[PDB]
Each structure stands twice: as C-alpha cells, then as structure tokens.
Coordinates of C-alpha atoms in Angstrom, one line a residue:
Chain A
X1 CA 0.0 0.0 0.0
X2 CA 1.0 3.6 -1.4
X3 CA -1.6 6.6 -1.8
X4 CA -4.3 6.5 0.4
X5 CA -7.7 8.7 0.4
X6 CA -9.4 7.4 3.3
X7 CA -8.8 8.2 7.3
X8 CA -6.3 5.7 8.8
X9 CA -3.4 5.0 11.0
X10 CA -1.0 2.5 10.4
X11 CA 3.4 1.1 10.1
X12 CA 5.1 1.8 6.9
X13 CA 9.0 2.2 6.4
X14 CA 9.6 1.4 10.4
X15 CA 7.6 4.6 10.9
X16 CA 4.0 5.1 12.6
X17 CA 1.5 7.4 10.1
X18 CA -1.6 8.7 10.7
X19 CA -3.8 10.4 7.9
X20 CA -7.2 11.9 8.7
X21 CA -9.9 14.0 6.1
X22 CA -13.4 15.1 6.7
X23 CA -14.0 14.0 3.2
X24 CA -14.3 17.5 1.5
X25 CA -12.4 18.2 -1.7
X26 CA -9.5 15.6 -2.3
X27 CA -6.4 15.0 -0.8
X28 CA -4.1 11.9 -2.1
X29 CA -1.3 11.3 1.0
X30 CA 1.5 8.5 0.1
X31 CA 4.3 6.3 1.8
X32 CA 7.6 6.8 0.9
X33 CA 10.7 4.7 2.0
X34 CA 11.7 4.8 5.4
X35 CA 10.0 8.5 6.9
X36 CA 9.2 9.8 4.3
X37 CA 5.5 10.7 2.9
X38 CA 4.2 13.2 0.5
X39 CA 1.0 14.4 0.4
X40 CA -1.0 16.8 -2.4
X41 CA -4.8 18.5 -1.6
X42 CA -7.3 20.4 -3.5
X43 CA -10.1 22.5 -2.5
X44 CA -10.2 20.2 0.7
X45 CA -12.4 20.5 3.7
X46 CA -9.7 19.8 6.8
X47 CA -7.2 17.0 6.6
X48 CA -4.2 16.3 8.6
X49 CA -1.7 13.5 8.5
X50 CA 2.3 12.5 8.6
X51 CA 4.9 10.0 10.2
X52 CA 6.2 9.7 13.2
X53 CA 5.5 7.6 16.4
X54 CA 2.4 5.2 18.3
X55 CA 3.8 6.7 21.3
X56 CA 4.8 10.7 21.8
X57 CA 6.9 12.2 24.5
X58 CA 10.0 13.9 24.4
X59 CA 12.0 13.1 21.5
X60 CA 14.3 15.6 19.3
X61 CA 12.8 15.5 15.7
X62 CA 14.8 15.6 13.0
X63 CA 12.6 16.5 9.3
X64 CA 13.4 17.9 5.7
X65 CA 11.6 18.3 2.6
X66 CA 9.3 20.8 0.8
X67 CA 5.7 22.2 1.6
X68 CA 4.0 24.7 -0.3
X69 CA 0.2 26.0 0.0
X70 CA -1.9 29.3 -2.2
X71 CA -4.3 29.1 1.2
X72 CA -4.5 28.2 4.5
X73 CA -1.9 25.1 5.2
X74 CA 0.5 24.6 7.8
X75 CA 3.0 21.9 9.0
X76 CA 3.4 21.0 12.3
X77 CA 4.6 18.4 14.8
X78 CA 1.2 16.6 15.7
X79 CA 0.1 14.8 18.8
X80 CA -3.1 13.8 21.1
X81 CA -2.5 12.8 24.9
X82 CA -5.3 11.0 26.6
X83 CA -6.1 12.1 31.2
X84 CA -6.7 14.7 29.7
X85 CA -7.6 14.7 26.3
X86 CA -5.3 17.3 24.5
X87 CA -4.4 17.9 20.5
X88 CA -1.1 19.7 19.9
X89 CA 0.9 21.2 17.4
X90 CA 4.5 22.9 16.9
X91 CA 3.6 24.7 13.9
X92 CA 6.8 25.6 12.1
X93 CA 5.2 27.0 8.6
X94 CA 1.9 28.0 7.6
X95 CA 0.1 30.0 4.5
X96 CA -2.3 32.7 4.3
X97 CA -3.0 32.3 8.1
X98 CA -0.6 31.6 11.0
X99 CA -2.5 30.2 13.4
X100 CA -4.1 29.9 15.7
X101 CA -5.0 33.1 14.6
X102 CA -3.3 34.8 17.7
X103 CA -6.4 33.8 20.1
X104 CA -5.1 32.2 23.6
X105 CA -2.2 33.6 23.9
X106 CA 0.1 32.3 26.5
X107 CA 3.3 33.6 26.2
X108 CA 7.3 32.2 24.3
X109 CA 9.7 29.4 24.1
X110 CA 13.0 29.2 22.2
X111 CA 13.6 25.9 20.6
X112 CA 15.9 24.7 18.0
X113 CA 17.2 28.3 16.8
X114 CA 13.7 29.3 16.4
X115 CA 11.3 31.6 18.6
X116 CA 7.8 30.1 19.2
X117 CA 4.5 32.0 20.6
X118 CA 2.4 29.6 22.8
X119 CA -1.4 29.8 23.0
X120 CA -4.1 27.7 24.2
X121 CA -7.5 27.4 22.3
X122 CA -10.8 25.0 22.4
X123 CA -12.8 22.4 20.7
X124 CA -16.4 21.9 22.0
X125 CA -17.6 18.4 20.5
X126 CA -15.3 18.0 17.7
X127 CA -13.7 14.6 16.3
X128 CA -11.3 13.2 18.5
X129 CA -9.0 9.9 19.5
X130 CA -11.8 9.3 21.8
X131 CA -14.9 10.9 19.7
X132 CA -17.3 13.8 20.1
X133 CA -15.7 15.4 23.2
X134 CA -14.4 18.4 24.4
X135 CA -10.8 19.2 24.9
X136 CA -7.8 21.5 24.5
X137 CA -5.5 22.5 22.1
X138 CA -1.8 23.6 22.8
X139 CA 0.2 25.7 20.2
X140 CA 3.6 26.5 19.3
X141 CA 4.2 28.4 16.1
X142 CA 7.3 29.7 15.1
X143 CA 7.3 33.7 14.6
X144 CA 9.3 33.0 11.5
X145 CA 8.4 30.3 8.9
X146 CA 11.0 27.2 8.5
X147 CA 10.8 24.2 6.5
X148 CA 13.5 21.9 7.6
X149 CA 15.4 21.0 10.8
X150 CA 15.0 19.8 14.4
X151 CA 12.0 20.0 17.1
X152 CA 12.9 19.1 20.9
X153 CA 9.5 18.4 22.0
X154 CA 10.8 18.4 25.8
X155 CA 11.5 22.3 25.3
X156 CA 7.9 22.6 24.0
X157 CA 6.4 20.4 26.8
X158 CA 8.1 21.9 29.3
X159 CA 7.5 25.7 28.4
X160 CA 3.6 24.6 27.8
X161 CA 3.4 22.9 31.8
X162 CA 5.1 26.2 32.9
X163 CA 2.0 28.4 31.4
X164 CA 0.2 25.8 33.3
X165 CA -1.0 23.7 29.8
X166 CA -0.4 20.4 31.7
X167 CA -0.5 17.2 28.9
X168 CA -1.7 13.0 29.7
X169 CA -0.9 10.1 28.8
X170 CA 0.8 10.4 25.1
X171 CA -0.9 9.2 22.6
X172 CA 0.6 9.3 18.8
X173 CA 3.0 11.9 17.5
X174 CA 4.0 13.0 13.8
X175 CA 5.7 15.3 11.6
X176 CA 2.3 16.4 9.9
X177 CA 0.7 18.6 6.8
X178 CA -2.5 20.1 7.5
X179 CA -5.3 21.7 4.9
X180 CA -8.3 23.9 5.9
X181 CA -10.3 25.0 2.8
X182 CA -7.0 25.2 0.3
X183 CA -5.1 23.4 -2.2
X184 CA -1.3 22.4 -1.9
X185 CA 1.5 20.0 -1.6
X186 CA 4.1 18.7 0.8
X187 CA 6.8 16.0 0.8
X188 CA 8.4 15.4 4.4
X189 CA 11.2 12.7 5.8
X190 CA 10.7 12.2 9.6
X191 CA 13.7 10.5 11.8
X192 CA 14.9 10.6 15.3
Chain B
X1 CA 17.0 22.1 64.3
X2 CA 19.3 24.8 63.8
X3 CA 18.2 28.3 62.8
X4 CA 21.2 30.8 62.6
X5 CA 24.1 29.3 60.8
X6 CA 27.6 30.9 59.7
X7 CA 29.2 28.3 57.8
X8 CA 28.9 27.0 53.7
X9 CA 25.9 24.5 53.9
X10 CA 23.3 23.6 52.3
X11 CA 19.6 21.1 53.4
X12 CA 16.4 21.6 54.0
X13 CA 14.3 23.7 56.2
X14 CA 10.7 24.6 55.8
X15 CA 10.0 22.5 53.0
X16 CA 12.2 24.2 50.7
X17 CA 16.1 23.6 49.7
X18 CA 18.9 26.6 51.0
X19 CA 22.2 26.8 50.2
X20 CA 24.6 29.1 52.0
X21 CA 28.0 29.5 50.6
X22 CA 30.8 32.4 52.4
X23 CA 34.6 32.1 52.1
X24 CA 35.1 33.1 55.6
X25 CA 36.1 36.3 55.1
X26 CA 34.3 39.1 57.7
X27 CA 31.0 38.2 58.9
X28 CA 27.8 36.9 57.7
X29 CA 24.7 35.3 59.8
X30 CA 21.7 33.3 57.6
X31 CA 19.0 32.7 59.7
X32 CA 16.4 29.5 58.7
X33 CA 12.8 31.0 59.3
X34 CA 9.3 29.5 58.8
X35 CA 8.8 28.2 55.2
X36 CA 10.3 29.9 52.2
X37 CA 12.1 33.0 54.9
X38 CA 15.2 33.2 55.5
X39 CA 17.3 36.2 57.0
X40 CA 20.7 37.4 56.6
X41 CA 22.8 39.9 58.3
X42 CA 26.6 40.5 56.8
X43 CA 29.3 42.6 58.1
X44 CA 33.3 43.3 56.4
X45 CA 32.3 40.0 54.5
X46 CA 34.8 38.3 52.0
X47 CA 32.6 36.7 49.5
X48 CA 29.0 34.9 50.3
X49 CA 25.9 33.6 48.4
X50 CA 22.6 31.5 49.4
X51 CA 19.1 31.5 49.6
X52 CA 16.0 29.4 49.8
X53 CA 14.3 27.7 46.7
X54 CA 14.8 23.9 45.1
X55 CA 17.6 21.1 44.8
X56 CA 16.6 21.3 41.4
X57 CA 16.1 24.7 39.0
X58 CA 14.2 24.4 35.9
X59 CA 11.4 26.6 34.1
X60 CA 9.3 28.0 37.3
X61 CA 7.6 31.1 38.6
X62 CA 9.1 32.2 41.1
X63 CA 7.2 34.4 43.6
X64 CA 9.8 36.1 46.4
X65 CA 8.9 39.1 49.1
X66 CA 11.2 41.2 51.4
X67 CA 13.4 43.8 52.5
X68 CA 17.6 44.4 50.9
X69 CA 19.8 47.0 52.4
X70 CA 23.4 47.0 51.4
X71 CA 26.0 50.4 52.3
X72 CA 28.2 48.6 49.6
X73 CA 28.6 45.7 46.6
X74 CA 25.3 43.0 47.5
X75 CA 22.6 42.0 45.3
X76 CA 19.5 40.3 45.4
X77 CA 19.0 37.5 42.6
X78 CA 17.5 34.1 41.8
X79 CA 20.5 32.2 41.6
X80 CA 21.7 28.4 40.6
X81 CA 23.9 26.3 38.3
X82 CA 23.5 23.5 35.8
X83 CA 26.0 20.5 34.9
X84 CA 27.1 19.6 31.4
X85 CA 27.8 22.1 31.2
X86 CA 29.1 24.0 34.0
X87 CA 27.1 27.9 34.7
X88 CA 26.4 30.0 37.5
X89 CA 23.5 32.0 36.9
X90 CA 22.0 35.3 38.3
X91 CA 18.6 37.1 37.6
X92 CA 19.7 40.3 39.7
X93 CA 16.7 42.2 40.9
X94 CA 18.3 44.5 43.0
X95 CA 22.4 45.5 43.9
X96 CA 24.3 48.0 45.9
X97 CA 27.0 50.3 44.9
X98 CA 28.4 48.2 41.8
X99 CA 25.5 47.1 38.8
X100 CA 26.7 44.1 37.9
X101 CA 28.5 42.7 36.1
X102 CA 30.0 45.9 35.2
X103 CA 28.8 45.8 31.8
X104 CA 31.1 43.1 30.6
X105 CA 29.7 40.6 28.1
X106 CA 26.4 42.4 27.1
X107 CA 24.6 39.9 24.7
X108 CA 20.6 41.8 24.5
X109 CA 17.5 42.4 26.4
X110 CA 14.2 40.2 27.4
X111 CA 10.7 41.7 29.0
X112 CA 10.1 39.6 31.9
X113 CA 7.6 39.9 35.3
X114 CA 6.8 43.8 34.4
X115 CA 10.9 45.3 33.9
X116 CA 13.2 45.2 31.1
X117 CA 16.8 43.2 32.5
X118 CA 20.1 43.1 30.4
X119 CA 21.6 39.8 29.5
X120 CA 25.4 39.3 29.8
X121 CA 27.6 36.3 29.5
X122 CA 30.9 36.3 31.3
X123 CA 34.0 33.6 32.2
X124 CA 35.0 33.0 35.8
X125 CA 38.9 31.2 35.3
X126 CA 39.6 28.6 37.6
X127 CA 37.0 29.2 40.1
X128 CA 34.9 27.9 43.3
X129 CA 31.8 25.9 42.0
X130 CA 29.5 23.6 42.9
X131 CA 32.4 20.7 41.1
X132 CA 35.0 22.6 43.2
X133 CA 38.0 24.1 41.3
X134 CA 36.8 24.8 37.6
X135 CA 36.3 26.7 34.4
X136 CA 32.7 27.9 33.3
X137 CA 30.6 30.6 32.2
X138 CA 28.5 33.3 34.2
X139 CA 25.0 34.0 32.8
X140 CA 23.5 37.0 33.8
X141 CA 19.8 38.3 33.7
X142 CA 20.0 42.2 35.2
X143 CA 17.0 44.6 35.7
X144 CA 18.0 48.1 34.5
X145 CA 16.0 49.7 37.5
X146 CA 16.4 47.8 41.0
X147 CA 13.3 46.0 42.2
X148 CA 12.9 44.4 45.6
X149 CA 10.2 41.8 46.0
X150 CA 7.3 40.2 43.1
X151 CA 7.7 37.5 40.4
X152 CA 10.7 35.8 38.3
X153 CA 9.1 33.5 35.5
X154 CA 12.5 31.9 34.8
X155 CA 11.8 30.6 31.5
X156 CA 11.7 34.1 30.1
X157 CA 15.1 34.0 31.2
X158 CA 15.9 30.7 29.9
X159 CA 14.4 31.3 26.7
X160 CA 16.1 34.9 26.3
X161 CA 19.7 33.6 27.3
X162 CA 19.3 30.2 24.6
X163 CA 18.5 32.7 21.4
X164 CA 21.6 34.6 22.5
X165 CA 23.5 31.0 22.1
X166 CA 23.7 31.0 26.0
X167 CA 22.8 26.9 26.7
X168 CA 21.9 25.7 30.5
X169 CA 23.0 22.0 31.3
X170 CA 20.8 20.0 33.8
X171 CA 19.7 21.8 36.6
X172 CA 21.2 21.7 39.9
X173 CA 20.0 24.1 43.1
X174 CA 17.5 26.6 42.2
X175 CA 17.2 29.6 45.5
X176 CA 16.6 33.6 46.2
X177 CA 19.8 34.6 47.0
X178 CA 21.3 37.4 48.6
X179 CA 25.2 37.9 47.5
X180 CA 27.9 40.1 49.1
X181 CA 31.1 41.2 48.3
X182 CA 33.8 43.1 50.1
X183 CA 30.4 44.9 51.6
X184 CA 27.9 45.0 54.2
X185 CA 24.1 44.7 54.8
X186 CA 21.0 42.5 55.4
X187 CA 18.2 41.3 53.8
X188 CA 14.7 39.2 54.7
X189 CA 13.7 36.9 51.9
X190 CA 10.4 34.7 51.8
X191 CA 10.2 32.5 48.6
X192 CA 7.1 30.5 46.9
X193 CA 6.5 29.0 43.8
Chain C
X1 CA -25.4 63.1 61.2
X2 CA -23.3 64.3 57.7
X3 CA -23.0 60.0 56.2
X4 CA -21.0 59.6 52.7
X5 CA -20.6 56.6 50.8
X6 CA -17.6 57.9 48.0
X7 CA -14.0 57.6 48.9
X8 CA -12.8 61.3 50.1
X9 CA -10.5 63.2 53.0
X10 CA -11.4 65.9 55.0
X11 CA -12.1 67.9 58.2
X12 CA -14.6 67.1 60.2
X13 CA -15.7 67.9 64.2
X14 CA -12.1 69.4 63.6
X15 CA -10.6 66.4 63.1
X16 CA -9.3 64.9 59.4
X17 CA -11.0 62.0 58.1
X18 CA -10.3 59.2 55.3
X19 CA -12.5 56.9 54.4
X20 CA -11.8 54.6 50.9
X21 CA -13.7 51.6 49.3
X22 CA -12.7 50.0 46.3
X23 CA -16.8 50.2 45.2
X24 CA -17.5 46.7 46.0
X25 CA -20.7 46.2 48.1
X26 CA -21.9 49.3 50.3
X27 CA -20.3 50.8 52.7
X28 CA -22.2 54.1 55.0
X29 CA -19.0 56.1 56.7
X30 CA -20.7 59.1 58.9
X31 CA -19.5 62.3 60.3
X32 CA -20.6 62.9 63.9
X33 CA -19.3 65.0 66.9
X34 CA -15.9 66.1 67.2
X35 CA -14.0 63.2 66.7
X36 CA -16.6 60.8 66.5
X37 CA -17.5 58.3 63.6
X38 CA -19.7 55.6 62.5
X39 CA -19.4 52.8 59.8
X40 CA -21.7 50.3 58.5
X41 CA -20.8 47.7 55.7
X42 CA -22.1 44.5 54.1
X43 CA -21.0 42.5 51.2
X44 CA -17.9 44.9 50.9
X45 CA -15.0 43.7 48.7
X46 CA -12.3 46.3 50.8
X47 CA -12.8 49.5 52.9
X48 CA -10.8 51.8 55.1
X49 CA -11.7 54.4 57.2
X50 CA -11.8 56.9 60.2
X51 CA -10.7 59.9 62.2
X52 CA -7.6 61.3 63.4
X53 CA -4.6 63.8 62.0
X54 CA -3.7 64.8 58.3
X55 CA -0.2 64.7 60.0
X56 CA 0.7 61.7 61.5
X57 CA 3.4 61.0 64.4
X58 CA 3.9 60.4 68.3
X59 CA 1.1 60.8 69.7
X60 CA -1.3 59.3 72.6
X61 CA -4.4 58.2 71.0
X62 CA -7.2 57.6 72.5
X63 CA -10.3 56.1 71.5
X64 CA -13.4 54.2 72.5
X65 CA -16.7 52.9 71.4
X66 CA -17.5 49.4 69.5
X67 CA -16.9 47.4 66.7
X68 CA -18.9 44.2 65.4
X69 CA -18.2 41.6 61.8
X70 CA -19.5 38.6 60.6
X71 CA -16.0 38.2 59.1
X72 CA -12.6 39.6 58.3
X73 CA -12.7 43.4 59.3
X74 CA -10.1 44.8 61.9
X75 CA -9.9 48.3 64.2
X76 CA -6.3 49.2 63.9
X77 CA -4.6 53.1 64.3
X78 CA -3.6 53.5 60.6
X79 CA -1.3 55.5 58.5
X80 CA 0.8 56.3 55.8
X81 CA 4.7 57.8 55.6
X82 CA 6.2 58.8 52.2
X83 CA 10.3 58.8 51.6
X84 CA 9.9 56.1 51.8
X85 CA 6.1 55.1 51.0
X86 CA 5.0 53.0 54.3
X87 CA 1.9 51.9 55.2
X88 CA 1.2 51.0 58.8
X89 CA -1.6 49.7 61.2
X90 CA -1.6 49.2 65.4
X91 CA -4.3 46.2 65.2
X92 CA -6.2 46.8 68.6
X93 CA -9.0 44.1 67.2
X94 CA -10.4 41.9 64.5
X95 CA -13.1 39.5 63.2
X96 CA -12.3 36.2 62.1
X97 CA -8.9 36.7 60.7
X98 CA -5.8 38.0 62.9
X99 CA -3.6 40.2 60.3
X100 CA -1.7 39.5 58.6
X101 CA -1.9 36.4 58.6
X102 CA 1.8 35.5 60.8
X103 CA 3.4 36.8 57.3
X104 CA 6.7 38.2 58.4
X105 CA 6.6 38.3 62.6
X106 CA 10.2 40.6 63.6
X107 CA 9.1 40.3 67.1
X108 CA 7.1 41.6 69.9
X109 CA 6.5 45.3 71.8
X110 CA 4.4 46.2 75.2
X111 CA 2.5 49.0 75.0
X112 CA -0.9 50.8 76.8
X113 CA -1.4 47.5 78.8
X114 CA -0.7 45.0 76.0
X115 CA 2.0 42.8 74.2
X116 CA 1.7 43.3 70.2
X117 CA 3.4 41.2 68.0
X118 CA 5.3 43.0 65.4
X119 CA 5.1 42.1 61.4
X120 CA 6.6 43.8 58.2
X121 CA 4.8 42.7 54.5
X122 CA 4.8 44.0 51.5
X123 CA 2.4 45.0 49.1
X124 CA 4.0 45.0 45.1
X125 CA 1.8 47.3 42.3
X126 CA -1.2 47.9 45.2
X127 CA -3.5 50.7 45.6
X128 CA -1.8 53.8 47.7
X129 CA -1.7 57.4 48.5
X130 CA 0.7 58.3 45.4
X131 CA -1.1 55.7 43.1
X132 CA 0.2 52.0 42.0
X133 CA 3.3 51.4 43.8
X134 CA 5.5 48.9 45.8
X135 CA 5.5 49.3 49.1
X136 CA 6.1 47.9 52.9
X137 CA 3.6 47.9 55.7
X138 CA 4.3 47.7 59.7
X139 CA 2.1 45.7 61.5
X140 CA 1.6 45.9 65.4
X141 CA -1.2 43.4 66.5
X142 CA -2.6 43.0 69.8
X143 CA -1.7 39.5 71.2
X144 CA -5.8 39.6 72.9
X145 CA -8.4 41.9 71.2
X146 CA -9.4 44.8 72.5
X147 CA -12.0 47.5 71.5
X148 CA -11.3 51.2 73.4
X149 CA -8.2 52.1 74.8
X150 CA -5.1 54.7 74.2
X151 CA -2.2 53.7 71.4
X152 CA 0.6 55.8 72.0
X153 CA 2.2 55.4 68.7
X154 CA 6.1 55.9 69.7
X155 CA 6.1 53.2 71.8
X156 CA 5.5 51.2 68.5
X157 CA 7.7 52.9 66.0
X158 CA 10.5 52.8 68.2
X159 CA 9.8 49.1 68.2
X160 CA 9.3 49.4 64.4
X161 CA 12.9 51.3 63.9
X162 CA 14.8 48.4 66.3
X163 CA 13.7 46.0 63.9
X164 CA 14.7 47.9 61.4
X165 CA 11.1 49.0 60.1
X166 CA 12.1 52.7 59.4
X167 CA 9.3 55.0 58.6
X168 CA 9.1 58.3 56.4
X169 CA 7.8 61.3 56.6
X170 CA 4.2 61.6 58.1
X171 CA 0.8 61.8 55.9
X172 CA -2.3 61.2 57.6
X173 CA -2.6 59.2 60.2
X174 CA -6.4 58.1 61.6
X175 CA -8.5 55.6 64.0
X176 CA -9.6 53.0 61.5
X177 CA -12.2 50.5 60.3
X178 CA -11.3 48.1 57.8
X179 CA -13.2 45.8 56.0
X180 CA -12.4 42.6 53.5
X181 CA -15.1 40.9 51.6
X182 CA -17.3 41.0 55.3
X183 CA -20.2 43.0 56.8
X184 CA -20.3 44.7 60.1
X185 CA -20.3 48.1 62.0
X186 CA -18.2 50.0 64.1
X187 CA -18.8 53.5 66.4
X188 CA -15.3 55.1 67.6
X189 CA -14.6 58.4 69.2
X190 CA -10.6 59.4 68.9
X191 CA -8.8 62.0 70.8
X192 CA -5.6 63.2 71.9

C-alpha cells in the first residue's frame, strides 16, 4: 500500500502514520521509503496527517523536505494525549494564516534556533482519538516560517506545563501537513 | 533544628532547599525561618551567596517578598547552576553600589515579570563551584531599575539567554539569594512557587 | 449626622478623616461630633476608614466605642509615611482573621497594657496614596483583642525602627475600620 484517500493509522517504512480528512475536496497522502511521505490536496475540507510515532513524548525530531500552499496550510509536529484529552501542534510553517489566529495567547519558548509564541485554544464536541468530546488545544508556532530541521519536544512540553498547559498520557505523535479549505502539496522525511 | 548558621551548607528547612556559601572572610549570619524565609545579616564579609528555593532549577515562577539593604557591593538575585555544562547564573533584581557585572559581556535584552533586565555572559577562570576548582561561564539576567520583591518567571530568562547562544546543562539548586562582596548589609527573603 | 458613601478626606468635628472603598458592596461612613465616627458595611469587597490627624506622628491616641463583623474586618490606628512610602496599622482588634496572617513576625512590643506582635509585608503594584506602587507595611497586632483604649504610637515605631522598620515622613494618620469581603459596623470616638 502507497496513496491513500481514506482516514487511517498505520506502520510503513519502520515509521508510525496517521492520515485523517473530513472528506471535502480531495487529498491523495502516500508512503515513501523509510520517513518519508508526500502528500497533495485540493479544495479540501480539513485533513491532517504524517509519520512519526504510536507513542509521543520527548523526543528531538529531525525532518526535511518541501511544503508549499496558495491558502490556509500549515506543517506541524502533531500529537493527542489521553487524562486529559489534549491535541497539539509545533507549527513551524503556515500559509495565508498563522494560526491559531493569535487567540489564547500564553506567552514564548525558544527551541531549535527558532522563537515560538504559545497559545491555548478550544474544541467543544469535535472529532477526537476518543470521539465527540471536548478538549484543548496547545500551540507552538514559530514567529518565522521554516521548513527543515529539528523539534525538541521536551523544550515545547516543558514551556507549555510552565503556562500551566499540563498534557496525559501520550498518545501518537508526527511530523504532519495540514489543509483547511485550500489546495497544496508537501513532501516530508521524519527521523529521530 | 538549627536556625542561625555561619558556615557554607546547604539542606532543607521549611519545605524548601537553601544553600549558604561564604569564604570566611568578615562576617555573615543566615537565619532559617518559617517556610520559604530566610534572613541574613553581613558585616566586612569576603565573598557569600545562598538563599532558599529547590535542589533542582528548571522553568518556574518564582514568587519572592522582602526587604535588601546593602551600604556597599550586595545583590538580590535568583541564583543556581547547571551541569554539562558547567554555569552559575544570576537574575539580579536588586544591587548596591556596583550594577553588575559591570557591563562586561552584554549579549541583549528580554521583557520579563513587568521590567526590562540586560543579559550578559561572562568567564570565571579557575574558580569555586559547585564541582570545586573549575572553568565555566557566568549568565546574567540584570533589571536596568532595581526592584525588591514580586515574580521571576524563569523561563523568560531561559528562553532569552538560549537565542543569545547562552545553553543551560541539567539543573542543579535553584534559591533567592542574597550575595555580598567586600560589603555590608542584610536582607529578609520569603520565597514561593 | 453628615454620612458619605464615595472615597474622600477631609475635616470634620475638627478632626481629618479618610474613608476609601474600592466600590465593592456598600459601605455608610458618617461624620458625627468632634472626633466621632460611625461605619456600617455589608458585602464589601475592601474598605478603610476613620478619624484622626492629616499629619501623623507620636502621639497618645485615644479612642473608644465598639466594633462588630461577621468576618474579616479589623480596628487598627492607621497611617501612611512617604520617603519612603509606608503603610502601617496598630491592630487593637479583628473578626475572624488576625492580620496578617503570621506573614513576616520581627518580634514583639508592650505598650498601653498589652503585648503586640510586630510584622513587616509588602504590598507589590497595590493601591496607595501616590497611586500604583511597591511598598512595605508595619504591622503591630494585639496579642488579645481589644476595643477602646489609648495607642501611643512611639512606643511602636521605636519598636518598628529596632527591627529595622524605618518610617518616612508623616501623611495622615487616623482611627480606623477596615473591612475585606465581610459586613459589620463600628462607632469610635478618637482623641488626643
């Protein structure tokens, strides 16, 4: 198995995926050797996907390749923990909207060269690891754009539990494209 | 338990860490009080340093009250080191007669608890630390007007010093010091997260 | 009979007053004889108030009359220095919490029949008589309540100044009620 169209998780080149769409537009997402995936959208509803790990935590993440968007895209280290129920994202590149939009915003962390604003935002019954529920969402997002290098997720983690954005149990963790009512392209190599 | 003490130590008293450093020079009295207090009285002192905080630093807000009086080189600082590598660091609230550290090493700014400080990285050349006799780097965190007592979010400090290339090891002890020098003075220090 | 209810100094049965209230609830401060006053709050979020001198110092005050809470109000001599700013309270009684609270006990002082035990605290960006400022206050409590009596106020600053609780120069300095998120009353004559 390649390209894939439909919501799934999965092994592929020693490397955990995970691939989600609500359906709306098309997006084709396909497994490459080893960490790598690439991944092209148009006119999509929301999708987002990537490789990485089953299990998160703190783990410096190495990734290179290309990404490229004419709406609103980002790419972004991806995770859920479970007790609580939290979705997360160290955003390093975006489009015609850096998100989250500058709403919940926390404070900084300095990570891997880079300087990263922090917010916290909500989802009241949205799709989930665990369903309709309600949970948090925790941000970084590079003040610059960059396409390429290293992400110590401790840094992030540790910077997010001292604005008092306290994560679970981890659940999975990748290297992920994302598309919210745009068209675009990406091709990414995850390792450790 | 002990309460007033005069020689380098360090334990556990109120349910917080101290650690109280002098050289022996002059005189200098730190007094273990209820909780996160401690006191300190110093006279013709050579060199001394401690306060009352954690075994082990990290990203933390640190809330700290009290009173600082110096008639010569003292300051008022959250203070603490980290192995591999090797630092002694200092965000300086308050100070005496002398601003440390004199200007040398200035590497930028960072907005942190309500004041603009100055960052500065300096060398101390075969030296007393925490792994005895060695070399390592100073970092410095200095408000450019003196405040006595409120909150030190220490990751602002953290954060600042990294994008200036200045890179903390693992934590080791964590406190709200009071440091004097060739000086004299007291100061009264309660310390929370 | 002359009752206000906005924050405000003055003169008054030639005496000065102060009386101050963040808003919060309603508190009635009234104006009576000479150097009688006469408070009534409920639901208050914070209130100060009473008679005595627009300039501080040592002095023998005396005062008498009664003072009654549901909760945490006090009767305290009260007063402000400036060079430096200082604000400072001999705590003759309270309600059901003894300031302030054993934060930062120096010691002890006998005075007008009573022991006191002596506290410094600080107050950092805080309402004051110059605006938003840092500041120190002295605290004298009485070790047992007690409503009427005299306060001769060098007794405590010289206590004060041993511990090293120096004081500035004198604004206004006045027999107080105080309230904190409490109801109650109080009636209090002052005089030299």
């Amino acid at each position: 198995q390649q390209c894939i169209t439909s919501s799934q998780t999965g092994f592929h080149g020693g490397y955990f995926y995970s691939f989600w769409t609500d359906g709306g537009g098309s997006v084709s997402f396909c497994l490459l050797n080893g960490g790598r995936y690439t991944s092209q959208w148009s006119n999509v509803g929301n999708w987002v996907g990537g490789k990485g790990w089953q299990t998160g935590g703190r783990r410096v993440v190495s990734y290179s390749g290309t990404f490229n968007t004419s709406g609103n895209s980002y790419l972004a280290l991806y995770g859920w923990t479970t007790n609580p129920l939290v979705e997360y994202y160290i955003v390093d590149s975006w489009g015609t909207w850096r998100p989250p939009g500058g709403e919940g915003y926390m404070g900084t962390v300095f990570s891997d060269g880079g300087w990263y604003d922090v917010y916290r935002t909500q989802r009241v019954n949205a799709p989930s690891i665990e369903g309709i529920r309600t949970f948090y969402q925790y941000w970084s997002v590079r003040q610059q754009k960059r396409v390429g290098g290293t992400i110590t997720t401790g840094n992030h983690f540790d910077a997010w539990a001292s604005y008092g954005m306290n994560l679970g149990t981890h659940n999975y963790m990748v290297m992920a494209t994302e598309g919210f009512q745009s068209s675009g392209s990406s091709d990414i190599t995850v390792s450790d």
